[PDB]
Design a binder for these strands. Structure first.
Ligand SMILES: [Mg+2]
Ligand SMILES: [Mg+2]
Ligand SMILES: [Mg+2]
Ligand SMILES: [Mg+2]
Ligand SMILES: [Mg+2]
Ligand SMILES: [Mg+2]
Ligand SMILES: [Mg+2]
Ligand SMILES: [Mg+2]
Ligand SMILES: [Mg+2]
Ligand SMILES: [Mg+2]
Ligand SMILES: [Zn+2]
Lengths: 87, 127, 214, 97, 249, 100
RNA sequence: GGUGAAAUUCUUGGAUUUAUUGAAGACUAACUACUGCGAAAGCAUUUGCCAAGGACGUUUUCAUUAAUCAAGAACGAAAGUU
């Protein structure tokens, strides 16, 4: 463990201030991390330009949220439609 | 022979409606209430006003041509009391005394399944 | 100053037709004026009325029935059993302390496009002889009973095209089939349906309605 | 349930993991039952499902993807499709599943 | 005085957008026969980041029902579309994330985007990242749905208006702060030329109403008439309220 | 101040912290245990009708139902009028339902 | 509407009231008890899944593994906080 708590956002050093570092850390973790690929099965990497993921070892591509594969809104709307399709 | 209204007496505290309707509900007949018939503000809920509200409904009923009514009642409901008012039952005497006929009486006070929060807050109305 | 009490019309409501009468009573509307017609206004009116009004007898004075107006044919307007209901005062007496009550909600597509939801009150029986003041069913038993009642109401709803499902519902034939199967688990009293709600319905099928009027 | 039964295979029983070996063994006819994952692509699902019908084999759809079938067959790695050549101790052959 | 920083914009010389990197006019299919009766399968070939766009695009390929040829159309990708998905568009297609019905076929509750204002607009409402219309109502007498737009402003639309089911991609972009000017730079550098904004107040009273004075201050109500004028309109235009807004929108 | 009571809030025994019920009058949140849960089985029509209603009515025998207000009261609210009735130290041990 | 005795306060270019819905995010009554479970905090509409758990029974098996515990931990009402 290098950083007690700047984590990834330690690139930014002493700039921008603990609140705007924290906010970004949360989403620069999320965006830089590897999903699990719905189809492939596998799990690496990959975001590439906001709301566009991915390829792991496969090559597809998938519209997601900016900083995460699935925004919560997407999952709830998947349900909303899951419910309203069944009617 | 007996044409049916549905009297629907909303007697909350501090008020009494008497709202005669068709059986579908849509087309009304009257909406005579307590604070209509007595200009005292206080005396809306009181029997006097409820009687005087129902008799004006009784008069307005017979002109259009209704014989009988289904006495529904509604005490406030849910977020308030759930407890029938003072001029709910004094309305029922006035519906009877007028000669407006009566058949299948209910109180459809919407006692909630699991109400959303009441008035007052936690400590309540501390008079 | 208008006063539309003179400017009015009196049409007749038409019950259909597993009950005794085929007429309930007498609603009203305004006339068929330009733009806002009378036939288009009357379709989509629900006359919730008692089941002792139709059948006459006091055994069915523990019930109500929603009656959705679909067609208007020569003043006389028809209806359809949109849903079933108890008045509030009836079920609350049957819920007494010192015993379990049970519900059972069952969503079911009929043969027609009519997604019926059906409920099922079913109290636990203060058994003969009892001195356990209570009559509390153990969760496990109520989790079977609620399954069994669903296994009933998946079978008798779905099947028989909805119109006949009323003919089974009206005279509490489904209600005994609940009791009979459940006695192997736990006795139970009363047992009705309480409500039947409705979600889906196709294009009117204007003329599907009148198969209950002749 | 299925997971208990595939455990009963993997301890004492003969079973193949993955596609080529599945297919090898559909063409040999040794395959008595193949357990296909979900996420396994519809193409290769439909390909197995074709071969299955020529071999008159059961195709149980393990509800859930391939990381959780590997789990279910006491494997670490993800497995897209299992075959059950022989597992007389277990009841998956007798079961419709 | 001069013409203001924000009167010229209109002229459109520099304050024209930048459309080098910009991929394609993000638009639905053209309507009729096929997709006003039954439906058609598209195929999502690519999902593709668009420069200067709230949310990535999808080259969804269909087939010309009258020529042996393919047409590729840039839909605004809804969180869910993925290369080699089958999009289905038109009346008889079903409720799935990426399909494109007409509000009519779409039950109340549903969640739609690239909703056409008028039908045949090839998309208007709810096209930016994360946004979506909710179909509130249905008036089958005079076929026109009520629809909520991200603003909130509920609005009556023709029931033959279309719109792609699902919520739009790039959702929750603005979560992140930018930090560092530079990232704001590169944001707008890829769109238009509004960025950095100097404050009227800071400028000379030549150059902007607020400008000048021996203290940077406005000095006459930053609220401005709606019936004001090119150059008068710098400050809070046609405000109802002002000040720190409490509560719901 | 020692214990007035052994029970205090009563139902709650072997039972962490139960849910509460808003009272009737004051709308005073009180636990559904401390609650003074009286049952008001009142007729839908008051006694001094009832004749009048049955005279003007259609049918015979009739529904003539009873509304089932299961009340609650915030003890204080209850004392101010209701069943409570401040008992003697020795009498406070009695759980017997009163009257009857 | 509201009223605590009493007032203010709102619309009428039918608000309210009557009926059909829609959305949203809430809660999840009546039963409901000197009842249940949970280490507590806490937990009541439904089914489903996920593992866990007490008691129970047991001519099961290991054979001292056990009780409580400063350091350290895990959870932890409401409020508050990003
Ligand atoms: Mg206050
Ligand atoms: Mg003291
Ligand atoms: Mg004291
Ligand atoms: Mg002390
Ligand atoms: Mg305990
Ligand atoms: Mg506690
Ligand atoms: Mg219990
Ligand atoms: Mg409950
Ligand atoms: Mg310690
Ligand atoms: Mg809190
Ligand atoms: Zn109180």
């Amino acid at each position: 463990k290098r950083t007690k708590k700047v984590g990834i956002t330690g690139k930014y050093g002493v700039r921008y201030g603990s609140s705007l570092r924290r906010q970004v850390k949360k989403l620069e973790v999320q965006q830089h991390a590897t999903y699990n690929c719905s189809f492939c099965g596998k799990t690496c990497v990959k975001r590439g330009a906001a709301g566009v993921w991915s390829c792991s070892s496969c090559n597809r591509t998938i519209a997601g949220g900016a900083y995460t594969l699935s925004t919560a809104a997407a999952a709830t709307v998947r349900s909303t439609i899951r419910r309203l399709r069944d009617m | 022979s007996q044409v049916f209204g549905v009297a629907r007496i909303f007697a909350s505290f501090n008020d009494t409606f008497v709202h005669v309707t068709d059986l579908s509900g849509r087309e009304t007949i009257a909406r005579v209430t307590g604070g209509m018939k007595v200009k005292a503000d206080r005396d809306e809920s009181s029997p006097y006003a409820a009687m005087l509200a129902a008799q004006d409904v009784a008069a307005k009923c017979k002109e259009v041509g209704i014989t009988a009514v289904h006495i529904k009642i509604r005490a406030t409901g849910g977020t308030r009391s759930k407890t029938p008012g003072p001029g709910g039952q004094a309305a029922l005497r006035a519906l009877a005394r007028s000669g407006l006929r009566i058949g299948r009486i209910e109180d459809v006070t919407p006692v909630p399944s699991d109400s959303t929060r009441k008035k007052g807050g936690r400590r309540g109305r501390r008079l | 100053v208008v006063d539309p009490f003179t400017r009015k019309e009196w049409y007749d409501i038409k019950a259909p037709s597993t009950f005794e009468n085929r007429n309930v009573g007498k609603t009203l509307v305004n006339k068929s004026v330009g733009l806002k017609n009378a036939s288009d206004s009357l379709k989509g009116r629900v006359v919730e009325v008692c089941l002792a009004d139709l059948q006459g007898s006091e055994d069915h004075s523990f019930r109500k029935v929603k009656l959705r107006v679909d067609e208007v044919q020569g003043k006389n307007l028809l209806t359809n059993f949109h849903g079933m209901d108890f008045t509030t005062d009836k079920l609350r007496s049957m819920v007494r302390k010192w015993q379990t009550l049970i519900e059972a909600n069952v969503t079911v597509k009929t043969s027609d496009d009519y997604v019926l939801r059906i409920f099922a009150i079913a109290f636990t029986r203060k058994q003969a002889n009892q001195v356990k003041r209570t009559s509390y069913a153990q969760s496990s038993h109520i989790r079977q009973i609620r399954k069994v009642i669903s296994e009933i109401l998946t079978r008798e709803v779905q099947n028989s095209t909805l119109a006949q499902l009323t003919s089974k519902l009206i005279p509490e034939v489904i209600n005994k089939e609940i009791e009979n199967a459940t006695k192997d688990i736990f006795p139970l009293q009363n047992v009705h349906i309480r409500k039947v709600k409705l979600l889906k319905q196709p294009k009117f099928d204007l003329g599907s309605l009148l198969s209950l009027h002749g | 349930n299925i997971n208990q039964k595939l455990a009963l295979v993997v301890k004492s029983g003969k079973y193949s993991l993955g596609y080529k070996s599945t297919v090898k063994s559909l063409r040999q006819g040794k395959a008595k039952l193949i357990i296909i994952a979900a996420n396994t692509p519809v193409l290769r699902k439909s390909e197995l499902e074709y071969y299955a019908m020529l071999s008159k084999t059961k195709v149980y759809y393990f509800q859930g993807g391939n990381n959780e079938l590997g789990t279910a067959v006491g494997k670490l790695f993800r497995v897209g499709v299992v075959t059950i050549l022989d597992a007389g101790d277990s009841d998956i052959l007798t079961a419709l599943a | 005085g001069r013409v203001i920083r924000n009167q010229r914009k209109g002229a459109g010389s520099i304050f024209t957008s930048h459309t080098r990197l910009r991929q394609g006019a993000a638009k639905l299919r053209n309507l009729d026969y096929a997709e006003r009766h039954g439906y058609i399968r598209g195929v999502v070939k690519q999902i593709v980041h668009d420069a200067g766009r709230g949310a990535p695009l999808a080259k969804v390929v269909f087939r010309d029902p009258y020529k042996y040829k393919l047409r590729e159309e840039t839909f605004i990708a809804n969180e869910g579309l993925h290369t080699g998905q089958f999009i289905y568009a038109g009346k008889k297609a079903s409720l799935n994330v990426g399909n494109v019905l007409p509000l009519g076929s779409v039950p109340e509750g549903t969640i739609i985007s690239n909703v056409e204002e008028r039908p045949g607009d090839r998309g208007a409402l709810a096209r930016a990242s994360g946004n979506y219309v909710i179909v509130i109502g249905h008036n089958p007498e005079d076929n026109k749905t009520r629809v909520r737009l991200p603003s909130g402003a509920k609005k009556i639309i023709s029931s033959d208006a279309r719109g792609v089911i699902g919520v739009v991609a790039g959702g929750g972009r603005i979560d992140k702060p930018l930090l560092k000017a530079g990232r704001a730079f590169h944001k707008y550098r890829v769109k238009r030329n509004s960025w950095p904004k100097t404050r009227g107040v800071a400028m000379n009273p030549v150059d902007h109403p607020h400008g000048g004075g021996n203290h940077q201050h406005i000095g006459k109500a930053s609220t401005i008439s709606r019936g004001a004028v090119s150059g008068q309109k710098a400050g809070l235009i046609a405000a109802r309220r002002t000040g720190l807004l409490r509560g719901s929108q | 101040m020692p214990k007035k009571r052994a029970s205090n809030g009563r139902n709650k025994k072997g039972r962490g912290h139960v849910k509460p019920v808003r009272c009737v009058n004051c709308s005073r949140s009180v636990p559904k245990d401390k609650a003074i849960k009286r049952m008001a089985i009142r007729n839908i029509v008051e006694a001094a009708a009832i004749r009048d209603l049955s005279e003007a009515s259609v049918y015979a025998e009739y529904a003539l139902p009873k509304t089932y207000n299961k009340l609650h009261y915030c003890i204080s609210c209850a004392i101010h009028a209701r069943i409570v009735r401040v008992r003697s130290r020795t009498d406070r041990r009695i759980r017997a339902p009163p009257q009857r």
